[PDB]
Design an enzyme around this catalytic site. Structure first.
Site, mmCIF file in Angstrom:
data_model
loop_
_atom_site.group_PDB
_atom_site.id
_atom_site.type_symbol
_atom_site.label_atom_id
_atom_site.label_comp_id
_atom_site.label_asym_id
_atom_site.label_seq_id
_atom_site.Cartn_x
_atom_site.Cartn_y
_atom_site.Cartn_z
ATOM 1 N N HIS B 40 0.804 -1.216 0.000
ATOM 2 C CA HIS B 40 0.000 0.000 0.000
ATOM 3 C C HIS B 40 0.848 1.282 0.000
ATOM 4 O O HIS B 40 0.304 2.384 -0.173
ATOM 5 C CB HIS B 40 -1.067 -0.036 1.096
ATOM 6 C CG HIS B 40 -0.549 0.257 2.460
ATOM 7 N ND1 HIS B 40 -0.256 -0.751 3.361
ATOM 8 C CD2 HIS B 40 -0.312 1.425 3.092
ATOM 9 C CE1 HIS B 40 0.143 -0.174 4.481
ATOM 10 N NE2 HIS B 40 0.164 1.134 4.357
ATOM 11 N N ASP B 84 0.264 -7.764 1.954
ATOM 12 C CA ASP B 84 0.715 -6.395 1.961
ATOM 13 C C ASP B 84 2.249 -6.321 2.071
ATOM 14 O O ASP B 84 2.795 -5.931 3.105
ATOM 15 C CB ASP B 84 -0.021 -5.612 3.032
ATOM 16 C CG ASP B 84 0.160 -4.128 2.949
ATOM 17 O OD1 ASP B 84 0.618 -3.639 1.849
ATOM 18 O OD2 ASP B 84 -0.195 -3.421 3.953
ATOM 19 N N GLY B 175 2.176 6.923 8.958
ATOM 20 C CA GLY B 175 3.577 7.225 8.678
ATOM 21 C C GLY B 175 4.583 6.146 9.073
ATOM 22 O O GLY B 175 5.730 6.199 8.639
ATOM 23 N N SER B 177 3.796 2.862 8.286
ATOM 24 C CA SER B 177 3.571 1.810 7.315
ATOM 25 C C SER B 177 4.823 1.455 6.554
ATOM 26 O O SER B 177 5.586 2.327 6.145
ATOM 27 C CB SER B 177 2.510 2.173 6.244
ATOM 28 O OG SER B 177 1.221 1.830 6.679
ATOM 29 N N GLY B 178 5.011 0.161 6.285
ATOM 30 C CA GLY B 178 6.138 -0.306 5.521
ATOM 31 C C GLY B 178 7.369 -0.603 6.362
ATOM 32 O O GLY B 178 8.271 -1.292 5.902
#
Ligand SMILES: [Ca+2]
Lengths: 12, 223
Positions: B40, B84, B175, B177-178
């Protein structure tokens, strides 16, 4: 569902 | 990160920032040419920023490298956030050193109760917004499958796990995410989603990296 991208997933 | 602490400059040397004129997601360096992040977080023309602490000030250890390739998991579903995961190839190899280093991939899946380190430059408030300049860190346990599914009925797949604190106050947030979830020195999770941030009974949900190790290695080999 709320992904954690900044500022938000929907705000892109 | 809500309820965390200031990590310390370059204490999480595998943490990267994905930047599009502003920080929007984190990532984890897995070798000198490849970063793991969340699907995402995909956008064309990303700049990867390695060796950061203060993301708003040049402090001397940064490497800014453009992404040359982005490979989203073939079975990613943006509706459910199943699968994801994304791989990013750097246009040139990062120069590895004490402040820029790879994190190991898992050899087996982690268990409930294992303490992990979650990090990023995401929101530090659960109500309203306050974004840090420097990298934040949180120690959090992996929750049981059953607790995870009870928290989020019908929404947890076999490619996700929950980590954090059901009483609220400590979590990843927008912020983050990942970015990485590291347990016993292995990258076990990717920050993915949650209902709000740091809310009671609503823990963080993370991509289960151990399910993807053969896909990651096959993808690096063929790109
Ligand atoms: Ca900096």
């Amino acid at each position: 569902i709320s992904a954690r991208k900044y500022p938000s997933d929907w705000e892109e | 990160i809500v309820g965390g602490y200031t990590c310390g400059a370059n204490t999480v040397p595998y943490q990267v920032s994905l930047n599009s004129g502003y920080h929007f997601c984190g990532g984890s360096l897995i070798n000198s040419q490849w970063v793991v992040s969340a699907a995402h977080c995909y956008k064309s023309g990303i700049q990867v920023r390695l060796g950061e602490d203060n993301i708003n000030v040049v402090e001397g250890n940064e490497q800014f490298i453009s992404a040359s390739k982005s490979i989203v998991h073939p079975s990613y579903n943006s509706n459910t956030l199943n699968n994801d995961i994304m791989l990013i190839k750097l246009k040139s190899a990062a120069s590895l050193n004490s402040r820029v280093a790879s994190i190991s991939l898992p050899t087996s899946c982690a268990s409930a109760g294992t303490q992990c380190l979650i990090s990023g430059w995401g929101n530090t408030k659960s109500s309203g917004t306050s974004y840090p300049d420097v990298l934040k860190c949180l120690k959090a346990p992996i929750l049981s499958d059953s607790s995870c599914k009870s928290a989020y009925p019908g929404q947890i797949t076999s490619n996700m796990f929950c980590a954090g604190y059901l009483e609220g106050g400590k979590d990843s947030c927008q912020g983050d995410s990942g970015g990485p979830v590291v347990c016993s020195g292995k990258l076990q999770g990717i920050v993915s989603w949650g209902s709000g941030c740091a809310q009671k009974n609503k823990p963080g949900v993370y991509t289960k990296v151990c399910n993807y190790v053969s896909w990651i290695k096959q993808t690096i080999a063929s790109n």
